[PDB]
Amino acid sequence: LKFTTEIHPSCVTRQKVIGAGEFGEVYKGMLKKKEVPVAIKTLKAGYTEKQRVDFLGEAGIMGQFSHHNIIRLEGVISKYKPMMIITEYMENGALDKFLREKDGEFSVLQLVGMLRGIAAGMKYLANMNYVHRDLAARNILVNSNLVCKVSDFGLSRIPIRWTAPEAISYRKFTSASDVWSFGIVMWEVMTYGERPYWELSNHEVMKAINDGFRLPTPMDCPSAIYQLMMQCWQQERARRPKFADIVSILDKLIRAPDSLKTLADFDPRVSIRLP
Numbered sequence: 001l002k003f004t005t006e007i008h009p010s011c012v013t014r015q016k017v018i019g020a021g022e023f024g025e026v027y028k029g030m031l032k033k034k035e036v037p038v039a040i041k042t043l044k045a046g047y048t049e050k051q052r053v054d055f056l057g058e059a060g061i062m063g064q065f066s067h068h069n070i071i072r073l074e075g076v077i078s079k080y081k082p083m084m085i086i087t088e089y090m091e092n093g094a095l096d097k098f099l100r101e102k103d104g105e106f107s108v109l110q111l112v113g114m115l116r117g118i119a120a121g122m123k124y125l126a127n128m129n130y131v132h133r134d135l136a137a138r139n140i141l142v143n144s145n146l147v148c149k150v151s152d153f154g155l156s157r158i159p160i161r162w163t164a165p166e167a168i169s170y171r172k173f174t175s176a177s178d179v180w181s182f183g184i185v186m187w188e189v190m191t192y193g194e195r196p197y198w199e200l201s202n203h204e205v206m207k208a209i210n211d212g213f214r215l216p217t218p219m220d221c222p223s224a225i226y227q228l229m230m231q232c233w234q235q236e237r238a239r240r241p242k243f244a245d246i247v248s249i250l251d252k253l254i255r256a257p258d259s260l261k262t263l264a265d266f267d268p269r270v271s272i273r274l275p
Ligand SMILES: CSc1cccc(Nc2ncc3cc(-c4c(Cl)cccc4Cl)c(=O)n(C)c3n2)c1
Pocket: 018, 019, 026, 039, 040, 041, 058, 071, 085, 086, 087, 088, 089, 090, 091, 092, 093, 094, 097, 141, 151, 152, 153
């Protein structure tokens, strides 16, 4: 915690609720240059020792990171109550909701650029020896430059449809199970926030994966992008790409953007036959 800035409560004004529930809220606010917008997570009085450890532990983890694609910590209020964690404010909110509300509005190159940013954040985390365990579009935040930043840190936090088989089966969470999750995130981005495996139950998903089924190609998806998410979903952990590999491949696709024009075939679930 010694790494984090202690912010005085008088510098913080909460303006609008934007999330959370039982033991605190998340607000958009202003931090007092001139005042800058921030997000503010609170911890209400009555919190337990474990709640305090997990709450300040998230701040402690975030304060150790300094990367473009990782949510930045402004500081904490720990001396006064309620306690607060103050971060940069991401104007466009969670990536999954953002894509669903903006269906079809971005170029393929913009979507792939979002994935590159997420992958760069994840490469940083993995090399820093941090395993996320809950990588999903709902835990990616988007700013007004369309920059995607990984969020939701700690060990306070399984989400079956995003989780690698070894993590479901015997609780082995590694950066390689995060790669599996990243593949699902690729699919979420390229589908504009479709629900993975649609209406299959959790048990049906686990069974489908164990029998070798994988999510089908999104519409209008570059062949290179589908091949890459498929390799993220290798049953054998050692065969998946590392995040270094993913960043490299996405970089090269974006720098030669004509590579993205070759689309993988889409399997239509409906046929319209007209004379
Ligand atoms: C779709 S919800 C939505 C809607 C509108 C705007 C934003 N922008 C935004 N921006 C930043 C954050 C930051 C945090 C945060 C904090 Cl405050 C402390 C510790 C960890 C996290 Cl991830 C946060 O929880 N949220 C919800 C944030 N939200 C989100």
